[PDB]
Amino acid sequence: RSSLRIRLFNFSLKLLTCLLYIVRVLLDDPALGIGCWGCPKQNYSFNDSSSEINWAPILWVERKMTLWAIQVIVAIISFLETMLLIYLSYKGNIWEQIFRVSFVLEMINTLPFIITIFWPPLRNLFIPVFLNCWLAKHALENMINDFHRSAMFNQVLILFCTLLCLVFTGTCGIQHLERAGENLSLLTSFYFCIVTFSTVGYGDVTPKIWPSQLLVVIMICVALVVLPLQFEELVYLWMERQKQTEKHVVLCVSSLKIDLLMDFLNEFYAHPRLQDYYVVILCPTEMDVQVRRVLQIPLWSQRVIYLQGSALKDQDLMRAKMDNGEACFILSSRNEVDRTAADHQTILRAWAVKDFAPNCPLYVQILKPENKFHVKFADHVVCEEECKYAMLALNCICPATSTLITLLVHTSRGQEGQESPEQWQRMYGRCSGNEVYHIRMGDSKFFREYEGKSFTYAAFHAHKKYGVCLIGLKREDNKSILLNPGPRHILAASDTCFYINITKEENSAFIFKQEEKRKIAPVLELAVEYVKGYPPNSPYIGSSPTLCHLLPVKAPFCCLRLDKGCKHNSYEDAKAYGFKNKLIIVSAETAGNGLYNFIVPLRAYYRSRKELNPIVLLLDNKPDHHFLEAICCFPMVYYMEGSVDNLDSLLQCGIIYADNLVVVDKEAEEDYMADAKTIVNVQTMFRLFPSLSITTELTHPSNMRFMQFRAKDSYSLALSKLEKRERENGSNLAFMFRLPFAAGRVFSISMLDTLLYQSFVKDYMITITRLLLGLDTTPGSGYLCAMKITEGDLWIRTYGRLFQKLCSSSAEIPIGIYRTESHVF
Amino acid sequence: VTFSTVGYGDVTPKIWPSQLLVVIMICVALVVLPLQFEELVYLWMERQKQTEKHVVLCVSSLKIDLLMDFLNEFYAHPRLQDYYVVILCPTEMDVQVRRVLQIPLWSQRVIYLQGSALKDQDLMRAKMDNGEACFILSSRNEVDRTAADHQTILRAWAVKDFAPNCPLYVQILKPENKFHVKFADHVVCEEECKYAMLALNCICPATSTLITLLVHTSRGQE
Ligand SMILES: [K+]
Ligand SMILES: [K+]
Ligand SMILES: [K+]
Ligand SMILES: [K+]
Ligand SMILES: [K+]
Ligand code: NA
Ligand SMILES: [Zn+2]
């Protein structure tokens, strides 16, 4: 880097000799006397009447003995180093050096100092050393090419430099050229030129001689031809440019849309702890127009950073400060028609981030279960197909389970519908503020008093006292969370207790102070027939093995088809079968590992064998033999070719005597229109079979209002006003009061996104959800069930007394109630 | 007169600290004002990308033919001259449509809003709760008419959900989808009328011509 040192020293000397020229003119007083270095110095005066101008003041300037030598030495070093570079670098051309305009200014401002050595009398001769500052500007430009010390900042700094040189040349030129007439000082000429460049033109000080007038004219032309070139360069940098704090998180997506961004921002910033965080979005695609408008909002302008780049490029991960991020959220693209390709992209992105920043927690959203074991290294992984079908299957067992999970994984204060005149809306919006929290039991004011007591005793009494629902615990010895360990489990101070409550125990410091404001058998302190086995052919790695009701012998693939008759049976539709129970018809496009996660919860060993519901898969495409091999061991699981829009196929399914119809059918530029085909197709069957229970999954929660649409219905139309009011108050649960959602008829997969975002603050949330869905089976962990409250159980007047009876007899823990009212339409 | 660069000179700083103040402050002016100018330029460029009794026109893609047929028929009545038309169309404004909107007969009457009926925010910008009528028109150029009919069914549902007391005027392509928008005040099925007129032309010649002239507002001056 010695070359840059040479130019830096060359730049330093250029500004030094210009400043030394300023020192000269500051100590040069013409009124004392001006001459040719010695004898005959002549005093002079300016006559405005006489047009002739004496050139002796302009030609000759009095130069100190120390001053002339030190500038000559500086000029000699100036001349030596510039020729040192010229001879050092030819680069294939000996000519053209003088035509480029830096040599002519160099030599004309330097070699006069060399020739002044020969003759004493002309040592006091004027040489325009102020023009040398232009070369110093040039010497700065070549420095910018190598070292920064911010891409356009250099041009702006250069623009200021050429402005300074224009001003500097003006002051020295005017002060010296008017030293013959009106004898302007430097300070006055400096103010003279500043008001000239800004075109003010005051006129109080003006050039009174023809040379000075000409200098202003030629200089005004120079300014008007050199400044626009700098302006155009700044314009070029600006147009090409148009195309923070600590504790940030990176959000890696393939395409970012307004729905995904708002879902993340609402959930991420719903916590007070994560308010000092800013979000970096690494998305290869250009920013969406709707996304741009939201980012211009000044709540999100300082918080959300959008970077156009790829996680597979380490340069883009450096711009995102991935090595410093608190967390990484890799989210799959669901709009992509090829989900295997999308899953491959997120696997690579997870691998790319892990390779770049190993000590960065990964939060990966995986589409297909077969690709889940490639990102198993990630701290938190959510498989959409596993949870979607497990929730859809549980809705067939426990109604509105998806609605129950949706509200729990959503961060809310339970303030929705608190002004509503309807009692059910107030209690529904209040109970929706429940969440799942964890606390060390010894540190827990809710459960510390139950030391040495059974889990069910603590769960009941904490609910009876504070209204908290102890659902599970995690022992300090193991890492496994158990839902409802049972009455045999004995509580300890090291256990981490998982409870459902409106507010965190620490955040409930008011009720404990409010507690201080006040200041059935009892639960005990101390406690063809089917085989039962595991499905043989697991379809994918990571499939949690659940003990299920299994056929004694594998069913041949011909017997799994409800359409065609075979050797074993001539039945051609569900009527010829004559099932004892009501059918579950699943209208899916393709049969994969997701549909496997639908059949497993319905065939589990704890599910009643007499209440087993036949499962009819209404597939658009013929299932491959691997899926049939995975489901050939399950009793009363059949498939057929058809769709929800074909009424012939649905009547062939047994829709007449089907208790549930699950529509998972998959089909646009306008985002909300993706569900148009599914919504209308489901609506047609809502009108053909009004009593049928149809469960649907929609891409957008905003479309949940269209599931069972009664246009001539004031009540459902009034719910729009309530939903808009909740949306006015900034509630993230605004779709909540729509009737199809509240009854469990619809859920969106976008809630799974909120579950992943919650895991950044609740590392147990994913495990709890899968434990409820049965997606992961830990020995000694409970399962979600439902019981019907019939008229023989109405002597149990309240929900608390039911909690007592369950905890005293069967040790079951009620999560909540699915309530039904008469709402004639 | 200093900031405007007029510089009259009748009053001027006669002392050096006053002269220096003018110098530094002129430099301050030339370095602080452009920063405000670039922010205005930044706001202006992104910005580039009324009365009572209006009607909203909800389409998927608006072309010059569809717009002029509406404008000619809507404004052929003297009662509907104080009305202005709001077009809610997700697609960007057509080049041919833009030129006609520049015509100052239609500049004050026709507003084009880029948005969806399925977003309530776009229905608030259209003042849907105050509109006199809503016209949901199917896209006939679309190769998939079932999908287009599904889009208009959702748009009718979205407008009915947002503004129940707003008369809907829905244009339906396929007869099988007509009973989903039966709640609308006025529904036209194109396939029903097209084939009924084509069949009547085989019975009564030029029945379609007879219907065409009747449903067109004209003074009989042709
Ligand atoms: K002027
Ligand atoms: K909640
Ligand atoms: K809460
Ligand atoms: K299907
Ligand atoms: K007519
Ligand atoms: Na069969
Ligand atoms: Zn068979």
Side-chain angles (χ1 to χ4, degrees), chain A residues 1-35 37-47 49-86 88-99 101-123 125-146 151-181 183-487 489-512 520-665 668-825, chain B:
Chain A
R1 52 91 198 204
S2 65
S3 64
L4 180 61
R5 297 160 50 193
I6 291 322
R7 316 182 272 247
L8 177 63
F9 186 68
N10 292 342
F11 177 80
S12 179
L13 59 76
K14 302 284 194 340
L15 77 94
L16 171 165
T17 180
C18 294
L19 176 63
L20 217 80
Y21 177 85
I22 292 266
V23 163
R24 195 296 306 298
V25 72
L26 263 154
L27 315 164
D28 167 67
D29 290 347
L32 297 174
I34 186 49
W37 197 226
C39 298
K41 294 167 57 176
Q42 291 179 334
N43 293 3
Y44 281 141
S45 64
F46 170 65
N47 201 206
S49 152
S50 317
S51 98
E52 259 282 300
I53 297 166
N54 296 132
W55 302 92
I58 296 171
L59 198 178
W60 280 316
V61 314
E62 279 300 323
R63 215 177 265 112
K64 223 53 204 174
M65 188 25 42
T66 59
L67 196 273
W68 178 114
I70 197 181
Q71 256 163 257
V72 157
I73 277 67
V74 167
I76 290 170
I77 308 153
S78 300
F79 197 79
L80 175 64
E81 297 234 14
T82 60
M83 251 190 221
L84 170 146
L85 296 171
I86 286 303
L88 175 66
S89 295
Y90 299 106
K91 199 127 51 75
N93 61 93
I94 315 305
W95 49 106
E96 279 308 321
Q97 290 178 334
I98 49 91
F99 288 106
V101 285
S102 183
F103 199 102
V104 309
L105 276 182
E106 192 27 66
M107 59 178 242
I108 298 310
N109 303 155
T110 304
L111 74 98
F113 280 102
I114 307 204
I115 192 91
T116 48
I117 300 171
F118 306 145
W119 261 52
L122 62 80
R123 292 200 208 112
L125 203 185
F126 159 57
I127 293 116
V129 197
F130 46 91
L131 309 167
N132 192 31
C133 83
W134 261 342
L135 280 92
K137 160 166 108 215
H138 278 325
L140 177 63
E141 182 279 346
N142 289 337
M143 179 67 181
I144 303 285
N145 277 46
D146 290 346
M152 149 288 303
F153 175 82
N154 313 352
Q155 188 66 28
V156 152
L157 180 62
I158 282 178
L159 169 63
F160 178 55
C161 284
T162 194
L163 249 202
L164 276 204
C165 302
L166 264 178
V167 176
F168 200 110
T169 303
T171 73
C172 289
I174 291 290
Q175 194 282 338
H176 196 314
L177 212 84
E178 301 221 59
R179 88 182 274 95
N183 212 99
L184 267 192
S185 296
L186 216 30
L187 189 269
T188 302
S189 45
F190 157 99
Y191 151 84
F192 170 43
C193 290
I194 271 291
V195 309
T196 294
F197 292 124
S198 178
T199 75
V200 165
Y202 296 142
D204 58 353
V205 310
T206 167
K208 310 284 328 181
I209 55 181
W210 74 257
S212 288
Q213 300 178 331
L214 221 57
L215 187 181
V216 177
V217 160
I218 69 147
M219 179 67 181
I220 283 169
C221 301
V222 157
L224 269 168
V225 304
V226 79
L227 274 173
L229 317 169
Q230 296 300 320
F231 285 145
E232 294 302 319
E233 303 332 303
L234 248 184
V235 165
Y236 187 90
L237 266 176
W238 158 286
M239 53 111 87
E240 80 188 291
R241 185 202 197 176
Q242 291 300 135
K243 31 169 169 166
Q244 206 192 277
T245 59
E246 282 92 350
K247 289 278 217 33
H248 74 299
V249 295
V250 191
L251 189 89
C252 192
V253 288
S254 66
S255 183
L256 183 88
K257 287 163 194 346
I258 189 42
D259 291 344
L260 182 176
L261 174 67
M262 281 333 311
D263 293 21
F264 175 75
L265 290 184
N266 292 341
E267 177 56 43
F268 192 70
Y269 289 116
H271 308 95
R273 186 161 83 51
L274 279 41
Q275 304 282 320
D276 51 320
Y277 283 58
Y278 69 96
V279 169
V280 179
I281 292 163
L282 189 63
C283 181
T285 36
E286 279 250 65
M287 203 201 271
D288 184 1
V289 48
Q290 200 138 212
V291 163
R292 207 169 236 121
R293 290 201 296 260
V294 152
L295 291 206
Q296 270 150 17
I297 296 184
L299 178 56
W300 313 122
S301 61
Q302 282 302 121
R303 287 172 155 176
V304 181
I305 304 182
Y306 186 97
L307 297 195
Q308 177 158 347
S310 299
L312 264 62
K313 278 162 152 304
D314 310 71
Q315 321 102 48
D316 296 332
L317 288 182
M318 290 213 162
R319 297 161 41 200
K321 281 106 52 195
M322 182 99 246
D323 50 84
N324 256 45
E326 296 310 308
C328 190
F329 299 85
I330 296 107
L331 321 156
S332 294
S333 294
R334 291 175 295 234
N335 43 56
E336 263 199 68
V337 303
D338 198 4
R339 308 159 63 83
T340 292
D343 264 334
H344 286 166
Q345 298 198 147
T346 65
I347 286 166
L348 276 206
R349 277 168 195 148
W351 291 0
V353 174
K354 184 67 167 181
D355 203 280
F356 189 89
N359 311 306
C360 182
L362 267 69
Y363 295 80
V364 191
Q365 206 147 29
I366 272 289
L367 291 149
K368 293 198 160 175
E370 43 266 31
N371 298 312
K372 196 190 26 156
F373 85 113
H374 284 317
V375 294
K376 164 144 190 243
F377 65 93
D379 299 73
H380 299 274
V381 186
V382 160
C383 190
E384 143 194 347
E385 275 199 358
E386 289 210 316
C387 308
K388 189 174 75 190
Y389 285 97
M391 295 196 288
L392 281 171
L394 278 182
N395 280 4
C396 298
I397 301 141
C398 323
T401 284
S402 64
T403 288
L404 167 80
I405 304 307
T406 302
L407 305 165
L408 275 175
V409 306
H410 269 263
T411 291
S412 62
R413 293 182 183 174
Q415 287 161 357
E416 284 94 359
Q418 291 319 291
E419 46 59 31
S420 175
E422 291 260 25
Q423 165 69 48
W424 82 265
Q425 281 171 341
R426 289 192 306 265
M427 183 176 282
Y428 174 59
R430 171 82 175 142
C431 288
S432 67
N434 282 265
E435 299 174 358
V436 181
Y437 307 101
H438 82 317
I439 188 166
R440 181 179 180 274
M441 156 144 165
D443 302 19
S444 85
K445 309 231 277 281
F446 285 143
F447 317 103
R448 158 207 307 140
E449 44 269 69
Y450 315 106
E451 277 304 45
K453 298 311 198 23
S454 64
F455 177 84
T456 62
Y457 179 110
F460 174 48
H461 282 273
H463 182 254
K464 169 169 194 165
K465 192 167 167 187
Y466 302 102
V468 297
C469 210
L470 195 51
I471 64 164
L473 52 75
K474 161 176 81 214
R475 268 198 203 204
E476 205 139 294
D477 291 344
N478 322 143
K479 292 180 179 179
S480 63
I481 300 163
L482 301 186
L483 289 193
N484 194 9
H489 192 281
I490 312 278
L491 275 182
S494 40
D495 300 330
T496 295
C497 293
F498 297 91
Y499 57 97
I500 297 172
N501 188 55
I502 286 270
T503 45
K504 291 174 65 175
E505 174 177 319
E506 308 92 310
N507 283 202
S508 69
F510 54 94
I511 186 183
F512 292 118
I520 303 182
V523 181
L524 288 168
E525 291 94 328
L526 295 174
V528 42
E529 268 325 300
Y530 308 140
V531 299
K532 260 150 100 203
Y534 295 86
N537 299 23
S538 296
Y540 57 95
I541 300 108
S543 186
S544 40
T546 323
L547 194 93
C548 293
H549 296 289
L550 289 189
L551 269 172
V553 199
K554 267 150 37 73
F557 291 2
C558 64
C559 294
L560 306 179
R561 184 154 208 201
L562 199 95
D563 288 350
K564 309 342 271 173
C566 51
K567 293 179 179 179
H568 323 77
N569 88 332
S570 149
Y571 311 171
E572 286 259 14
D573 49 6
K575 184 179 57 64
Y577 281 78
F579 307 103
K580 305 290 261 143
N581 298 309
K582 311 213 82 59
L583 285 70
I584 298 166
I585 294 158
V586 200
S587 178
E589 190 221 89
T590 324
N593 297 331
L595 251 198
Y596 183 80
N597 287 297
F598 184 92
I599 302 163
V600 164
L602 293 157
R603 289 300 176 266
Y605 79 100
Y606 38 70
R607 308 293 166 200
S608 189
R609 181 198 308 140
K610 288 318 92 153
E611 322 194 11
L612 271 203
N613 283 324
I615 291 147
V616 176
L617 310 171
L618 188 52
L619 314 163
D620 276 342
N621 323 134
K622 205 79 156 73
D624 70 78
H625 84 254
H626 306 283
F627 179 75
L628 299 187
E629 243 304 334
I631 69 143
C632 70
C633 51
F634 286 130
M636 303 162 317
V637 177
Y638 311 98
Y639 76 94
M640 143 158 46
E641 297 303 317
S643 312
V644 76
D645 50 23
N646 198 36
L647 180 69
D648 306 336
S649 69
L650 278 174
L651 290 163
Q652 284 181 241
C653 296
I655 204 180
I656 291 316
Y657 38 70
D659 57 357
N660 274 269
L661 168 63
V662 188
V663 185
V664 199
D665 277 341
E669 160 275 290
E670 165 175 0
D671 47 7
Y672 288 8
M673 277 313 190
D675 308 308
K677 170 158 199 322
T678 301
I679 283 175
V680 174
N681 286 7
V682 166
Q683 177 77 9
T684 309
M685 308 306 164
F686 169 61
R687 314 283 321 270
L688 292 173
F689 317 97
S691 161
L692 176 74
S693 177
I694 302 162
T695 311
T696 326
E697 203 272 300
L698 289 179
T699 308
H700 310 284
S702 269
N703 292 338
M704 289 196 194
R705 25 157 187 170
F706 296 141
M707 155 90 183
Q708 300 198 145
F709 190 80
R710 307 136 187 290
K712 303 270 145 283
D713 190 70
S714 66
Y715 201 103
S716 321
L717 266 50
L719 284 171
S720 325
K721 309 318 172 283
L722 172 55
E723 159 163 338
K724 293 179 179 179
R725 269 195 307 270
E726 305 293 338
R727 295 176 64 186
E728 253 162 23
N729 313 343
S731 192
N732 55 357
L733 296 173
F735 54 87
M736 146 201 300
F737 295 103
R738 296 304 182 154
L739 292 195
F741 172 78
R745 292 305 127 81
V746 183
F747 82 92
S748 184
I749 214 55
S750 313
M751 67 174 282
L752 274 206
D753 309 7
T754 302
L755 174 60
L756 191 72
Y757 312 143
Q758 254 209 325
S759 294
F760 182 51
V761 199
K762 310 175 154 229
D763 45 343
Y764 49 87
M765 183 66 75
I766 282 168
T767 305
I768 293 295
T769 311
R770 309 184 95 243
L771 284 166
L772 284 160
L773 303 181
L775 282 182
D776 57 350
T777 78
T778 320
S781 178
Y783 59 105
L784 188 57
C785 295
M787 83 153 39
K788 260 262 190 213
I789 292 169
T790 50
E791 297 317 13
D793 314 288
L794 260 305
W795 61 274
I796 310 149
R797 314 172 329 256
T798 52
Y799 173 82
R801 299 228 305 154
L802 183 71
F803 214 135
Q804 176 179 337
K805 176 190 164 171
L806 297 168
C807 276
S808 63
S809 49
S810 294
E812 320 160 86
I813 297 183
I815 291 183
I817 309 161
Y818 182 69
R819 198 155 267 181
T820 300
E821 315 178 0
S822 62
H823 186 16
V824 316
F825 297 95
Chain B
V1 317
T2 295
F3 296 128
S4 37
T5 75
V6 166
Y8 270 141
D10 58 353
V11 307
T12 168
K14 306 176 172 65
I15 50 183
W16 65 262
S18 283
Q19 298 180 331
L20 169 62
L21 163 50
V22 180
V23 163
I24 170 168
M25 183 99 110
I26 280 170
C27 300
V28 159
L30 271 167
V31 305
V32 79
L33 274 174
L35 316 168
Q36 297 300 320
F37 265 108
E38 63 185 342
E39 293 299 319
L40 245 184
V41 166
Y42 187 89
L43 266 176
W44 155 283
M45 257 210 276
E46 283 76 304
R47 185 200 196 173
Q48 292 299 135
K49 32 169 169 166
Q50 206 191 278
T51 59
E52 282 92 351
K53 290 277 218 33
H54 75 299
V55 297
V56 192
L57 189 89
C58 192
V59 288
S60 65
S61 65
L62 184 88
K63 316 263 198 283
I64 190 42
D65 290 345
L66 159 66
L67 176 65
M68 293 309 335
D69 302 24
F70 177 73
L71 291 181
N72 294 339
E73 177 55 43
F74 193 68
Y75 288 116
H77 308 94
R79 194 185 91 220
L80 274 45
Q81 304 282 320
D82 52 321
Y83 283 59
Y84 68 95
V85 168
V86 180
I87 292 161
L88 187 63
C89 180
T91 36
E92 286 179 270
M93 183 176 282
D94 187 12
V95 54
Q96 209 135 20
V97 163
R98 178 138 20 198
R99 293 172 195 173
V100 191
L101 292 204
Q102 271 145 14
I103 297 185
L105 179 57
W106 312 123
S107 62
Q108 282 301 121
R109 287 172 155 176
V110 183
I111 319 166
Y112 186 96
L113 296 195
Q114 176 160 349
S116 299
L118 265 64
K119 314 205 108 215
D120 309 71
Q121 53 254 63
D122 296 332
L123 291 182
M124 305 201 138
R125 296 162 42 200
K127 289 94 62 185
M128 191 97 236
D129 61 356
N130 290 304
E132 295 310 308
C134 189
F135 299 84
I136 296 107
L137 319 156
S138 295
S139 294
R140 293 173 297 226
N141 43 56
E142 206 153 326
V143 303
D144 198 4
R145 308 159 64 84
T146 291
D149 264 334
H150 286 166
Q151 299 197 147
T152 64
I153 286 166
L154 278 199
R155 278 168 196 147
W157 290 359
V159 173
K160 183 66 167 181
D161 202 277
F162 189 90
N165 310 305
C166 181
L168 269 71
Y169 295 81
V170 191
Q171 206 147 30
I172 272 289
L173 291 149
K174 293 199 160 176
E176 43 266 31
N177 299 312
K178 196 190 26 156
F179 85 112
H180 284 317
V181 294
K182 171 151 182 253
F183 65 92
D185 298 72
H186 299 273
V187 185
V188 159
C189 190
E190 146 199 340
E191 275 199 357
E192 289 210 316
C193 308
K194 189 174 76 190
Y195 285 96
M197 293 192 293
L198 280 170
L200 277 183
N201 279 3
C202 297
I203 288 129
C204 324
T207 284
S208 64
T209 289
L210 168 80
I211 301 307
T212 303
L213 305 164
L214 275 174
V215 306
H216 271 265
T217 50
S218 62
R219 293 178 179 83
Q221 287 161 358
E222 284 94 359

